[PDB]
Amino acid sequence: PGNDPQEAVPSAAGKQVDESGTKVDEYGAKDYRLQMPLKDDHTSRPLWVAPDGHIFLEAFSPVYKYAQDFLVAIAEPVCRPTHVHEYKLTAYSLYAAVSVGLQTSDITEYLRKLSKTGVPDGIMQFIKLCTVSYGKVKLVLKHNRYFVESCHPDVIQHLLQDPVIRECRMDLFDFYEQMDKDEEEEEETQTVSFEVKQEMIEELQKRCIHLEYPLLAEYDFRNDSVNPDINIDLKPTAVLRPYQEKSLRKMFGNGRARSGVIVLPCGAGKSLVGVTAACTVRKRCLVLGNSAVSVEQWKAQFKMWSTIDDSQICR
Amino acid sequence: TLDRCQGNLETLQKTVLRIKETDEQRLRDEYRRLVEGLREASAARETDAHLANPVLPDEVLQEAVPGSIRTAEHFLGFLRRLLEYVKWRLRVQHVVQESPPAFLSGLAQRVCIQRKPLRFCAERLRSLLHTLEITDLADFSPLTLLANFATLVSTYAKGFTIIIEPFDDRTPTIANPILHFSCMDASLAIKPVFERFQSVIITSGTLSPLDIYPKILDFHPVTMATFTMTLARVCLCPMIIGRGNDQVAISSK
């Protein structure tokens, strides 16, 4: 219970999907995917927006338009089959709460701007901003500072609901120490961060945070300052490769507080980046192996690309 | 240095003892001329081996021949100085102490006649060697250090700074203590420069904040920002790193 964010939308509004008759919002597309291709370029081609199921990728004359968006349009898509220089199908899911450096209306504009006003059914519309971007920093005072957002227009519903549920509130040797605290700036703009309600109330709060129409992003401020201890990490000449160099760069494009979940293909640097996350982050980490089968393996490359082993090993 | 100086203390005394009137009446003709009309004895390369002016922005050394009338008497003034100066050194080696004009005041308890023989010393250091004209300079070099020092302590100390640094810097023990007299007003190093000059132009290819010319504590009519175009494609690549993977920590936190 209390585990309900926005499930994947399309369930209805369609009957015998051969919409040779209706295709009404696709007729908005099929107007401009067809009115536009006359003089040797298409300037059209809406990714073949289909209301139910998913939509496609053009990817056959991408040039710059959809070849840039061979990747970038795929944020909420997943591109489930792969092909030759032709169309490419996908699916659709939860992947807007990952795409939180952008507004659901901002993509909707470019969802239209890709589609040459190939208009949504609305199915996506009633599923665009169901979860407004919102983070949960874990700042220096031992639990969390009640961060909201770069943008203000969300506390206006929140503080009119949340506190009426649950409130919130030598020289040169030390000169640089406040120069670090000087770097503790506005968190890109305004932050709007509040004070911990006694560390035992967030569980009571999180279940009601999502309860209106928001969703929360748990972070990990464990790198600049940390009050408990730090283990000895040491990356002994572990030269690695740009598939996983991009990975932690996606885990850290911001500051030192954001969690992460990354998919690799099989046989990839699985026991590398977590071992890289074991050492760079400066935490005291944990692996949850699938079986002891995993457990022997994952320490072994940890025994390889970390010299952290002086009975410092916990299987 | 001081112990070597302590060693050539009585070393120079032996030169005084062996010379009875030969260089001594040479002094007597001209030390009278020091009293009568003040003029430096040499205008040639001797001044190169000589502290020209330790404290330049002063008026003149008018009442030379300070509270010191004889040479061994003047030598005793350094016996009154150095032996007290190690007394102002050796006990002080336990605590770093930053008291620039308080030192010379407590010195005035210890030094009998002060603030004139403090300032009128380094020439009378030199001039009583000038009637000798004997001692090799590298031998005499750690001594010229010392009569430079209290001369500087005599004149410019209330704006300036005395620092005593006995503890660990390349000495793991206390095996070489040191103190320093720093000035602080590079302005007052460059104020006489500016008064001697007309209006003179700094150019620094690094100086981005113009606000640090008032760290020189001075006035400026012309202080702007030179902007050049680059049709050379791109002058350079400045590249701030900030790694995210290996997690930049490049300042020594």
From Swiss-Prot, chain A:
Designated name of the protein: General transcription and DNA repair factor IIH helicase/translocase subunit XPB
Cellular compartment(s): Nucleus
Binding partners and assembly: Component of the 7-subunit TFIIH core complex composed of XPB/ERCC3, XPD/ERCC2, GTF2H1, GTF2H2, GTF2H3, GTF2H4 and GTF2H5, which is active in NER. The core complex associates with the 3-subunit CDK-activating kinase (CAK) module composed of CCNH/cyclin H, CDK7 and MNAT1 to form the 10-subunit holoenzyme (holo-TFIIH) active in transcription. Interacts with PUF60. Interacts with ATF7IP. Interacts with KAT2A; leading to KAT2A recruitment to promoters and acetylation of histones.
Species annotation: Homo sapiens
Disease linkage: Xeroderma pigmentosum complementation group B: An autosomal recessive pigmentary skin disorder characterized by solar hypersensitivity of the skin, high predisposition for developing cancers on areas exposed to sunlight and, in some cases, neurological abnormalities. The skin develops marked freckling and other pigmentation abnormalities. Some XP-B patients present features of Cockayne syndrome, including cachectic dwarfism, pigmentary retinopathy, ataxia, decreased nerve conduction velocities. Trichothiodystrophy 2, photosensitive: A form of trichothiodystrophy, an autosomal recessive disease characterized by sulfur-deficient brittle hair and multisystem variable abnormalities. The spectrum of clinical features varies from mild disease with only hair involvement to severe disease with cutaneous, neurologic and profound developmental defects. Ichthyosis, intellectual and developmental disabilities, decreased fertility, abnormal characteristics at birth, ocular abnormalities, short stature, and infections are common manifestations.
Residues included from the entire protein: 30 to 391 of 782
Modification after translation: Dephosphorylation reactivates the 5'-excision step. Phosphorylation has no effect on transcription or the 3'-5' helicase activity.
Top-level lineage group: Eukaryota
Binding of ATP, residues: L264, P265, C266, G267, A268, G269, K270, S271
Family: Belongs to the helicase family. RAD25/XPB subfamily.
High-level lineage: Eukaryota, Metazoa, Chordata, Craniata, Vertebrata
Reported function: ATP-dependent 3'-5' DNA helicase/translocase. Binds dsDNA rather than ssDNA, unzipping it in a translocase rather than classical helicase activity. Component of the general transcription and DNA repair factor IIH (TFIIH) core complex. When complexed to CDK-activating kinase (CAK), involved in RNA transcription by RNA polymerase II. The ATPase activity of XPB/ERCC3, but not its helicase activity, is required for DNA opening; it may wrap around the damaged DNA wedging it open, causing localized melting that allows XPD/ERCC2 helicase to anchor.
UniProtKB/Swiss-Prot annotation, chain B:
Parent-record interval covered: 255 to 507 of 760
Upper classification of the organism: Eukaryota, Metazoa, Chordata, Craniata, Vertebrata
Disease linkage: Xeroderma pigmentosum complementation group D: An autosomal recessive pigmentary skin disorder characterized by solar hypersensitivity of the skin, high predisposition for developing cancers on areas exposed to sunlight and, in some cases, neurological abnormalities. The skin develops marked freckling and other pigmentation abnormalities. Some XP-D patients present features of Cockayne syndrome, including cachectic dwarfism, pigmentary retinopathy, ataxia, decreased nerve conduction velocities. Trichothiodystrophy 1, photosensitive: A form of trichothiodystrophy, an autosomal recessive disease characterized by sulfur-deficient brittle hair and multisystem variable abnormalities. The spectrum of clinical features varies from mild disease with only hair involvement to severe disease with cutaneous, neurologic and profound developmental defects. Ichthyosis, intellectual and developmental disabilities, decreased fertility, abnormal characteristics at birth, ocular abnormalities, short stature, and infections are common manifestations.
Family: Belongs to the helicase family. RAD3/XPD subfamily.
Domain remarks: Interacts with GTF2H2/p44 via the C-terminus of this protein; mutations in the C-terminal region of XPD do not alter its helicase activity, but prevent its interaction with and helicase stimulation by GTF2H2/p44.
Subcellular location: Nucleus; Cytoplasm, Cytoskeleton, Spindle
Post-translational modification: ISGylated.
Entry's transmembrane regions: none
Function recorded in the entry: ATP-dependent 5'-3' DNA helicase. Component of the general transcription and DNA repair factor IIH (TFIIH) core complex, not absolutely essential for minimal transcription in vitro. Required for transcription-coupled nucleotide excision repair (NER) of damaged DNA; recognizes damaged bases. Sequestered in chromatin on UV-damaged DNA. When complexed to CDK-activating kinase (CAK), involved in transcription by RNA polymerase II. In NER, TFIIH acts by opening DNA around the lesion to allow the excision of the damaged oligonucleotide and its replacement by a new DNA fragment.
Protein name per its UniProtKB record: General transcription and DNA repair factor IIH helicase subunit XPD
Gene behind this protein: ERCC2
